[PDB]
Amino acid sequence: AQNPNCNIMIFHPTKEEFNDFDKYIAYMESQGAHRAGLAKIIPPKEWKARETYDNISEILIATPLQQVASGRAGVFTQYHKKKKAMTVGEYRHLANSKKYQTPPHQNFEDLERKYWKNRIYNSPIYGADISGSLFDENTKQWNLGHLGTIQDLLEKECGVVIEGVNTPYLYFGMWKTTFAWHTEDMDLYSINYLHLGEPKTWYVVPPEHGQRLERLARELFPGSSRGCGAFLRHKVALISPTVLKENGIPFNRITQEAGEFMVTFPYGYHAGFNHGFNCAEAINFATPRWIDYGKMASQCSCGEARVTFSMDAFVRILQPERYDLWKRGQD
């Protein structure tokens, strides 16, 4: 078995190897990359997502989210308070202000220490889930707005034709902005490209150990657990690496820098934070190996997680028994 310790792998495709996305994902899995839950892909040196970022300040963040924490430093929830719209130019200025800017630090490790020590005492503002793309239409390789769609994969593998579309989202982050412990909708893959700015640190649990994280989460968030049998779908819970180590949960960590892709694999729980002002783009995708994960994915039926138009069809076709009760939560 390849990569038995489930380490995060880093790949350096040639420009030749960068032409066929599906084939490269299948290559990575042949080397065991999926066992980690997360992989880094460094694009060939000849490749670019676009010519410059010089004109992005006029993108609108229509609903910036202020991420308010409750709990203790290593075990907390966050709630998202909606703020008034602002442009990317306004947001970047806010991120760079004395109140919100990255503090002085020695290196990534010192900054990670400061994050876990101090996150709960601040409420950074996150521009999340903004439909759009920053890839130039002329970028032909690994353009996240030109991937084959999940609906087309399900059609190719299973023969069923369904409604729905699949488009990318932009994320504008600042120091301490946080993504809570989650897997993707329907335990899909995700791919994330860091277009610009400061790094993003990721934590990940190997898919084969995801249930260990869920069991810990039920112990640490016991009222949330009683309210919903898949409460990590709410994307509100944080657990520090110290806490994970104290409870024996297998995990890994890695820092993504501007110009790098990350791929998350089906049922790979992940969480993380941003080091300072940045802009990432991400989208879900599928392969044939995903299908069985999609059939087994947990669902939130309490009604909090409230998810896309396209997820309907996935649940309807892959999880017909659940369909009924899931859509009671969604309506």
Ligand SMILES: O=C(O)CNC(=O)C(=O)O
């Ligand atoms: O970048 C972020 O804030 C969150 N992204 C993801 O969870 C992802 O790409 O799967």
Ligand SMILES: [Mg+2]
């Ligand atoms: Mg603009």
Ligand code: NI
């Ligand atoms: Ni994700």
Ligand SMILES: [Zn+2]
């Ligand atoms: Zn729920």
